[PDB]
Amino acid sequence: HAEGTFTSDFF
């Protein structure tokens, strides 16, 4: 979620 981006919000 923005701050989390796909890298953190992967899967």
Short mmCIF file of N, CA and C in Angstrom, two decimals:
data_model
loop_
_atom_site.label_atom_id
_atom_site.label_comp_id
_atom_site.label_asym_id
_atom_site.label_seq_id
_atom_site.Cartn_x
_atom_site.Cartn_y
_atom_site.Cartn_z
N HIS A 1 0.84 -1.23 0.00
CA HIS A 1 0.00 0.00 0.00
C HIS A 1 0.86 1.26 0.00
N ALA A 2 1.29 1.68 -1.19
CA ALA A 2 2.12 2.87 -1.34
C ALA A 2 3.40 2.72 -0.51
N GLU A 3 3.34 3.08 0.77
CA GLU A 3 4.49 2.98 1.66
C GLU A 3 5.03 1.55 1.68
N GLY A 4 4.13 0.58 1.50
CA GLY A 4 4.53 -0.81 1.51
C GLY A 4 4.92 -1.30 0.13
N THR A 5 4.38 -0.67 -0.91
CA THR A 5 4.67 -1.05 -2.28
C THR A 5 4.46 -2.54 -2.51
N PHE A 6 4.80 -3.01 -3.70
CA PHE A 6 4.65 -4.42 -4.04
C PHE A 6 5.70 -5.27 -3.32
N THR A 7 6.88 -4.70 -3.11
CA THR A 7 7.96 -5.40 -2.43
C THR A 7 7.51 -5.96 -1.09
N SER A 8 6.80 -5.13 -0.32
CA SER A 8 6.31 -5.54 0.99
C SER A 8 4.92 -6.16 0.89
N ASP A 9 4.11 -5.63 -0.02
CA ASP A 9 2.75 -6.13 -0.21
C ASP A 9 2.69 -7.24 -1.26
N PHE A 10 3.84 -7.85 -1.55
CA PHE A 10 3.92 -8.93 -2.53
C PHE A 10 2.84 -9.98 -2.28
N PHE A 11 2.73 -10.94 -3.19
CA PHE A 11 1.74 -12.00 -3.07
C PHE A 11 0.32 -11.43 -3.11
#
